Ligand binder design. Sequence first.
Ligand code: GTP
Ligand code: GTP
Ligand code: GDP
Ligand code: GDP
Ligand code: MG
Lengths: 433, 432, 430, 423, 91
Amino acid sequence: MREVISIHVGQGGIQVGNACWELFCLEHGIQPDGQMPSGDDAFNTFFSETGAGKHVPRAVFLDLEPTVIDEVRTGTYRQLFHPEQLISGKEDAANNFARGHYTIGKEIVDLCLDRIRKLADNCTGLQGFLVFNSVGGGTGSGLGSLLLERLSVDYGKKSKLGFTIYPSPQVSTAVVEPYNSILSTHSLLEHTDVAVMLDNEAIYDICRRNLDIERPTYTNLNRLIAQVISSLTASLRFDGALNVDITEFQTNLVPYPRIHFMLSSYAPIISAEKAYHEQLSVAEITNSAFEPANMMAKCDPRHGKYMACSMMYRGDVVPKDVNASIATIKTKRTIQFVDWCPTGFKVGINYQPPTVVPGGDLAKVMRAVCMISNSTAIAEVFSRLDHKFDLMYAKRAFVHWYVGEGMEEGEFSEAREDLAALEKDYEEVGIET
Amino acid sequence: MREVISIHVGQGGIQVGNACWELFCLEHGIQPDGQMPSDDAFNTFFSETGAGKHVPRAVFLDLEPTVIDEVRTGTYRQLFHPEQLISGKEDAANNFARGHYTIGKEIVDLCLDRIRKLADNCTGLQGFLVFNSVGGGTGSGLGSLLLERLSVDYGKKSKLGFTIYPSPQVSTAVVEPYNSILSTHSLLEHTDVAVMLDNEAIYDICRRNLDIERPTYTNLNRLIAQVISSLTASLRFDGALNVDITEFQTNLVPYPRIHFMLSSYAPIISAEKAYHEQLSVAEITNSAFEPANMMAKCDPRHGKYMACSMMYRGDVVPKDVNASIATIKTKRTIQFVDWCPTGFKVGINYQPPTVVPGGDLAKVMRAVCMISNSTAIAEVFSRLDHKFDLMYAKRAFVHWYVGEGMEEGEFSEAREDLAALEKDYEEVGIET
Amino acid sequence: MREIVHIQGGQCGNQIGAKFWEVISDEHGIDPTGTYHGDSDLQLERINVYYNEATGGRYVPRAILMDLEPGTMDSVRAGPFGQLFRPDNFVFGQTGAGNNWAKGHYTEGAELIDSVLDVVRKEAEGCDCLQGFQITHSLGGGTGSGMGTLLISKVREEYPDRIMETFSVVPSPKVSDTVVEPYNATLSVHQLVENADECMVIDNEALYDICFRTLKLTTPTYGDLNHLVSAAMSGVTCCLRFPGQLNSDLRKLAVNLIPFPRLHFFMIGFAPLTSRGSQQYRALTVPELTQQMFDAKNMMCAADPRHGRYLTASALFRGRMSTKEVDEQMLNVQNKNSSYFVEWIPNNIKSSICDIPPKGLKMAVTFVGNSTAIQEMFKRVAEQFTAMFRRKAFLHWYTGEGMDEMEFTEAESNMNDLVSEYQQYQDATA
Amino acid sequence: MREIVHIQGGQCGNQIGAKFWEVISDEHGIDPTGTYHGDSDLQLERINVYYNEATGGRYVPRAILMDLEPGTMDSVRAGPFGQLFRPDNFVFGQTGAGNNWAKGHYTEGAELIDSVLDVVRKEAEGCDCLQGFQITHSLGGGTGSGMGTLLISKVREEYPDRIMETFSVVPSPKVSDTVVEPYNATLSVHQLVENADECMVIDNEALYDICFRTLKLTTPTYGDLNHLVSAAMSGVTCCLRFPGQLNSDLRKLAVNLIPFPRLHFFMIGFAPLTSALTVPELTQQMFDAKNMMCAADPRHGRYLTASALFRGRMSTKEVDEQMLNVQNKNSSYFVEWIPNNIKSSICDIPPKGLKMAVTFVGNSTAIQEMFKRVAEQFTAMFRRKAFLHWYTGEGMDEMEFTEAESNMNDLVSEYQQYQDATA
Amino acid sequence: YPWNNRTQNTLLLKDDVGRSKPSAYSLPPVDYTYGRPLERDEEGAKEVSMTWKYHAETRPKEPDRDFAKLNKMSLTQGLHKSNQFSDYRKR
Ligand SMILES: Nc1nc2c(ncn2[C@@H]2O[C@H](COP(=O)(O)OP(=O)(O)OP(=O)(O)O)[C@@H](O)[C@H]2O)c(=O)[nH]1
Ligand SMILES: Nc1nc2c(ncn2[C@@H]2O[C@H](COP(=O)(O)OP(=O)(O)OP(=O)(O)O)[C@@H](O)[C@H]2O)c(=O)[nH]1
Ligand SMILES: Nc1nc2c(ncn2[C@@H]2O[C@H](COP(=O)(O)OP(=O)(O)O)[C@@H](O)[C@H]2O)c(=O)[nH]1
Ligand SMILES: Nc1nc2c(ncn2[C@@H]2O[C@H](COP(=O)(O)OP(=O)(O)O)[C@@H](O)[C@H]2O)c(=O)[nH]1
Ligand SMILES: [Mg+2]
C-alpha cells in the first residue's frame, strides 16, 4: 500500500527516466508488453493494477520540447504508459528559463497539476515524491520550479526528494548554463528536504577507471543512475532485516532544516572482465565505498569533515559483515567527523540481489551497496558556481534576453544573498565548539 | 593466517619475478590459468575467490609498456590481476633525475592505492618483498621513492629488499656508477635489510656446476626464483624448527647502520644421466662456505664473518646440522669474532625443494641456503666508490641530470654517505 | 491464576515476541495449531498463566501486536507457529514513525494507543487474576520507545497495585544503528524510571560478546541472538509454573532485588553456555554452573561487573540439585569477592531451586543481580545526548511536532541526577 | 587429592607436552578417546592427580598450552592423542615474538597474558587441594621464555602457599641455535631464581651423547629426544600416584633436596636404557655411566646432596646397603658438612615395559660452570653492544641489563664458596 | 582470420569501439555469480544449547581365543588325533 509517483521534466530527465523503467520493468516481472508473465503483490509501490491483465506504472512525462516525447511513443515501450499521461507542449523554451517560468510553463503546469491529483486519488499509502530534471536548462528549470512550488502548497507535509544534475565544473553543453544553475538554486532551496549531486563529469570516470569504456556515451550514464534509484527503492517493496521508511531518510540526513544537499555513491560496479578475479568482501567493498574517486560528485571530501552518512546494503550480506567493517571506518584517520556528531552511520539490510539490464556493461554480483551522505565540502560547487556569476554579470552580457522575457532585473540580485547566505551557513556549521 | 605482498619494479625487478612466480606456481601446484586441476598452503602466497581460481597478489610496475605488454602477450595471459598492472608511458633512460622526480610521481599515487587495496584483503601481513636493480634509471628513481613512501605510511612493518648491484667488470650499462651511488643513500635508511646478487657471480655458478656453455639472461632467473623458496620455505610448511620473516632481520644486523646481507645456494647438480650420489648434508654444508660457490663476487676470506643463519631443506636431521656447525668453526680459514661467540641461526624444513621441469636444476633429496653477513662486504662498495669518483672529477654526464631538476649538492651528500658507511664497516671489526 | 499478559511493540517486540512464544510453546507441548501434545501431565498445571481456554480444546497465547509499520507483524504471521496468535489481537497503522519519538509519542500513537488499550483492557478483565506485566521494547528506535513507554504510562494508571517487567535493548556506543540513538534513549529513560518497577537492559554488542567467544559459532544471524535473549527471559518465571522446593514468583523476585525505590535497574544472565567443543569435555555441576554465572563475560550488558560493586544476587537454577551444595556455592562465592559485594548488608546472594530444568539439559541457571557498572552505560549515553545538544543539532524535527526546548533539559537532568544517586551508594560506608 | 596442574609455553613446551602425556597416557592405559580400558585396580585410584572428571566417563588432563605463534597449536592437534585436551583451554596469539625476549616479557605478554592468566585460576579453583604447579619451558627459546618467566612471577604472588615446579633447558656453546642466546639466558635466571622454587636444568647437547653412546640409535630426532625427559618426568611424580613403602610427595623431596634458600637448581638422570638386571647394576650407572642430562661434570666439584628413586619391588636392605656403599667408595661421585645426603623411596609398580628403573636427582655443586660459560658469552656480546638495540627500543634500558650480571655474578661467588666450605 | 580488427588474438588487436571492450580472461558463461557467497554457518543458535551431545563411549577391545582350555574340553570330548583337533577347534 506504499507507493510514490514519478515526475519527469526536461530532456535529460526523460532520457534518464527511460532507463529507470527498463530496469524496474525487468525486475518485478512485468514485461514490455505489460501482460503479467505466464500473487506476491510486492510491486504495489510502483504499479497500479488495472483490474485484469497488464499494469500501468505510476508515471507522468512532461517536456516542452516535442522530440523527447515523440521518441518514446514510436519505440518498443508504447504499450506500457497511458497515452493521456504524455502532456507535451508546442514551442520549446530554447534554454530560456524565463520562457519556461513566466510565459510558457504556466500554460502547461495545470495539466501537469491536473493529472497529479488523479494519480493521487488511486494511491492509498502515498509516501513521497520524486523530481527528475537538471539545472542547466531553461525549459526544465522553469517548469521544475513550478511543479515543486505548486505541489508544495497543495500537499505540504508530504515529503520531497531532489534529483537534479548540476553542470560540471569544467565541462558543459550550453554557454549560459550558470544563470540557470543558480536561479534554480534560488527557489528550490525553499521547497526541498533532500538534494543530491549528479555532476555528469564524475560519472564518466567510473566508466573509464573501472568500467574501462574508452568512448562512453550518455546512454551509459543513464543506466547507472537507474541503479541508484532502484538501489533506494528496495526497502520499500520487500522484506528486509532492518527496514527503513522514506520517513527515516530526511530523518537522519537533515541535521538542520536548510542544509539538504547530499552526494551519492554506489559500488561495486565492474564489468564481466575485472570482477572474475575478486572476492567482493564486505570489508573491501565498504572500503571502496569511501574511496575518494567512487563518489558520484566531483568534490573533495578531504577538504571537509563528515557530518552524517546513511548507507543501504543489499544481497546476501550478513549483519556481522557491516558493523565490523563499519567500525574500521572510524579507525581511518584521513576521514575526520564533525565534533557534534558522535555517530553518523545509518544501516540498511535486505535479501534482494542487484538487477542488471540485459546486454549492458554491468555484471551480476551477490553483494552491492549504495552510499548517500551530507558533507561540508559541497560548498565548493556553489563556491565555484557563484564566482562564475560575477564574470557573466560584470558587463551584463546576455542580460538583454532574460530581463525582457518577464523576469525583473532585481531577481538576480536577491538570489546572490540566498547563495551568499548559504555559503556562510556551511562555514558556520563546521566550526567546532 | 600468514601472508606476504609482492612488489616488483623495473625490468630487472619485473623480469626476476617471472621466473619467481613460475617456480612458485609449479611448487604449490596451481594451474597456469589458475583453475585447480583435480591444504590451505596457497594461503601463504594465494588467496581464495573463493569458488574458482587463485591469484598471486603480485604488483608489476614500470615506466615502459614494452616489458609490461609481453606479460599481456606472453604465456601467462590470465593469472595476474589486470587492474594491478599499472604501467607508465616513457622511461627515464638510466636517468635517476628523470626517473625519480619527473615522471615517477605520476604513478607513485596509483601503486600505493593498489598496495593498500592488497593489504586489507589479507589479515596476517608479516612483511612485503621489494625487488629492484640499481643499475638502471627507471628502477632506481621509482624504487627509491616507493621505498621512501612505504616506510612513512606503515613504519615498523618489516620489509625485505633484493637489490642487484653492477658487476665488477662486465656491465651492460655505461652510467651505472652515477645511478648506483645515489641509490645507496636512499635505501640505506629506508629498508631494513637487503642482499647482494652481482651479475657475474651468477654467471660462474651455472658454468662450474651446471656445465652449460650457452647461458643467457634466462638461466640466472631460475637461480633467483630458487633462492626465494629456500628462505620462504619455512613460512608455509611443517619443520622441526620453523623460522619466520621477523627472525631474519632481528638476528643478522649487529648495529642499526650495518644491515646488508649476502646469499649462497648449493648443491647445484647439472641435469646429466650419471648415478650421482646421496649428497649427505655434512658434505653439502661444506659446499656452502667455499668462496667460489659464493653467490656474489665478494671474497668472504678477504674479510671476516659476522653472523650466519643457515637453512636446510629436505630430509635433514638436526644432529647432522649441529655437528656440521663445529667443523666449520674448527677450520682456521674462517674466523668468528670475539664479540659473537655464537652466530648461527638454523632452520630445518621438511619439503624437498621442487625443481621447475625443463630448466637446468635437478631433483636432490637435500639442499641448503646459506645466508651470512661478513665485514668483507665493503669490497664491493670499495670498488663502486672508485668508479664513481673518477667520473665526477671532470663533471662528466652531470649536465644531463641537473637540467632535469635534481639539485647539485646531493652528489656531495651521497658520496660522503658511502664514506661514512665505509668508515663504519672498518670500526666494527676492530679487535676489542 | 497468578498470571501475566504479553504486549510487544515495535519491530523488536515482534521479533522477540515471535521468538519468545517459540521457546515457551515447545516447553508446553502445544502445536502451533493450539493443541497440546506434551508427554507429561506437568506441562498443564500452570497452563492458564500464559494461555486462555477456547472452543475445540485448542489453545491461543495472550499476545497483542502494536506498531506503526504493518510489515513488522506481517512477517510474524507467515512464520512457523504464527497461527497461534489471535488475529483479533492484531492492530496496525499506516503512517510510519520515521524513528521520531515525538511523532510516535505525541501525534500518531496517542491516536493509535486507544485501540490497543481497549483491547488491552479486554484481557486484563478477561484474566482471572492479573499478577503483573512484562513488556519488551527497544529504546534505540523510533516507534518502539514512544508507544512502548506511552502504553506504559497509560496502563499503570489503572492497575497501580500490579507488577511489570521491562526488557529493553539499550544501545551501546560500539555498534550504532541510527543517528538519533542518543536522543530517543534519553526521553524514554525519563518516563520509564518514573513508571517502570522492574526493567532489564540488554546490550546487543555484548550479545555478540557472549556469542562470538562463548558460543564461538561461525557466523551469527539475527535469528541467533533472539534465541538467547528469549531463553534468558523465558526462564525468569521458570519456577512459577512448576512445583519446586522454594517457590519463586515474579512478586518474590521483586522483593529480594530492588533495595531502593528508584534503583530498578538489573542485569540478567543465563547458563550453561559454551561452544560445541565444550559440549563433550566440560563437566556440568552446580559448582560448574555457578562459575559461569559469575564470569564477567556472561552478563548480557556492556557494563563490566568488575567496574562496579554488586548489590543483590539471586540465582534461578533448573532441575534437581542438593540445596546444601548450592548453599555453599553461593555461600563461598560471596566470600571471595567481598570488595565487589555490598558491605552494609550480609548474605547478598539468593538461592532459588525449582525442580524442573529446561528441556534438553539437566543443569541451567538464570543470573539476575544489581551492580553499579550500569552507570557506565547511562553516563556514556549522558554526553552523547549532550554532545550533539549544544548546537541543537537535528532538533528542528523534534521542535516541529509540538515539542519545545523546555522538557529536553528536564530529561538530561533526571538521568544525571539518576546516575549520581545510583553511584552515591557506591562510596557509602557503614 | 594433592592434584597438580600443568602449564607450558613456547615451541619446546608445546611439543614436549604432546608426548609427556603420551608417556603418561600409556601408563594408566587410557585411550585417546578418553575411555578407560585398564587392568590394575590401583590404576584408577589416584587418576585425579592428573585427570579431571568429564561427562560420559571421559577424563581430560588439566593442561593448558600457551604460545604467541600458531605453529605448535594447530600442529599439535593433528597428531595422535591430540583430542584429549580441552578445546577451550587453548590460548594463542597472532604474532609470535620472533625470539625477542623483551617482546614476550613486557609488550606482547602484557596484552595477551590475560587469557593465559584467565584459564589458570579456573583449573586450580576446581582442585580439592592444590599440590603444585609443573611448568616446562626453555631458557634458550624466545617466545616461550618471555611469557614463561612472567607467568612464573605471576603465579607466586597470588599463591604464596603452594609449591611450584619448573623446567628449563639452558643452551650450551656446543649446540648454538640462536645468536640472541646469550642475552635471553642471563635474564631468565634472574626472575627464575627470584620466583621459581624448584628448577631442573637439561642441556640439549647432553641428550645427543646418551642416545649415541648408550642408545646407539642411528638417527636422533626431536621426537626421540622428547621421550627421555618423559621417563625422568614420571619418576618425579611416580610415587605421588602409586603406593609404596615410603611414599614421597613433591614437598618431601624439596624438603630433603634443597638445603639452603638460593640453591635451587638440580641435575637428573634416568635408567636403565639399553640398545635379569639386579640391584647393583643400577647404582653404578646411577652416579656414573654418562647418564647425566647436564653438561656439568659432578666429578668437577662436590655434591651438596642427592636423592634416588626405586620403582618396582625390592628389598630395602639392598636399597640401604647400596646407598651406604656408594657414599664411602666415592668420597673424592658428599661434602663433610652434610652427612648422609642421599634420599630414597620405593614404589611397587615400575614403568610399563621395564622391571626396575631409577631416576637421578642429586644437588651437585658442579652446576656452577653452567652459569660460568653462559655468563662468559654474555659479556662478549654485551661488551660491544651487539644486538642490544632490539631490547632497548621495546621498553628496556641498559640499566636493567647490568643488574642481572651482578645478581648472577653474586650468584656464582656464593654458590662457588659452598664448594670450598670446610668444617 | 585475425586480419585487421575483426577477431581476437590478444589485447593489442582488440580496438574496442562503440560501447565497450571485449572479454579477455575466460569469462560476456552468461550469468555466473562472482564472489564467495555467505549467510552459511551450519549449526544454529537455537540448536546450540538444546542438544548438547555427549561422549557416547568408545568400543572395548576384543579378547583373543583362549587355548589352554581349548585343549581341556577337547580332551574331555574324546578326540586325540591331529585331524580331529582340526575339527573341534572350528566348532
Ligand atoms: N544524465 C544525462 N544527462 C543529460 C543527457 N542529455 C542531456 N543531459 C543534461 O541536460 C542538461 C541541459 O539541459 P537541456 O539540454 O537544456 O534540456 P532541457 O532542460 O529540457 O532544455 P532544452 O534544451 O530546451 O530541451 C545538460 O547539462 C546535461 O547534463 C543524458 O543523456 N544523460
Ligand atoms: N639478474 C638479471 N638482471 C637483469 C636482467 N636483465 C637486466 N638486468 C639488470 O638490469 C640492469 C640494467 O638496468 P636498466 O637497463 O636501466 O633496466 P631498468 O632498471 O628497468 O631501467 P630501464 O632499462 O630504463 O627500464 C643491469 O645491471 C642488470 O643487472 C636479467 O635478465 N637478469
Ligand atoms: N537482536 C536483534 N535486535 C534487533 C533486530 N532488529 C532490530 N534490532 C535492534 O533494534 C534496534 C532498531 O530499533 P527500531 O526497530 O528501529 O526501533 P522502533 O522503530 O521504535 O521499533 C537496533 O539498534 C537493533 O539493535 C533483530 O532482528 N535482532
Ligand atoms: N628436546 C627438544 N628440544 C627442542 C625440540 N625442538 C626445539 N627444541 C629446543 O628449543 C629451542 C628453541 O625453542 P623454540 O622452538 O623456539 O621454543 P618456542 O619458540 O618458545 O616455542 C632450541 O634451542 C632447541 O634446542 C624438541 O623437539 N626436543
Ligand atoms: Mg529539453
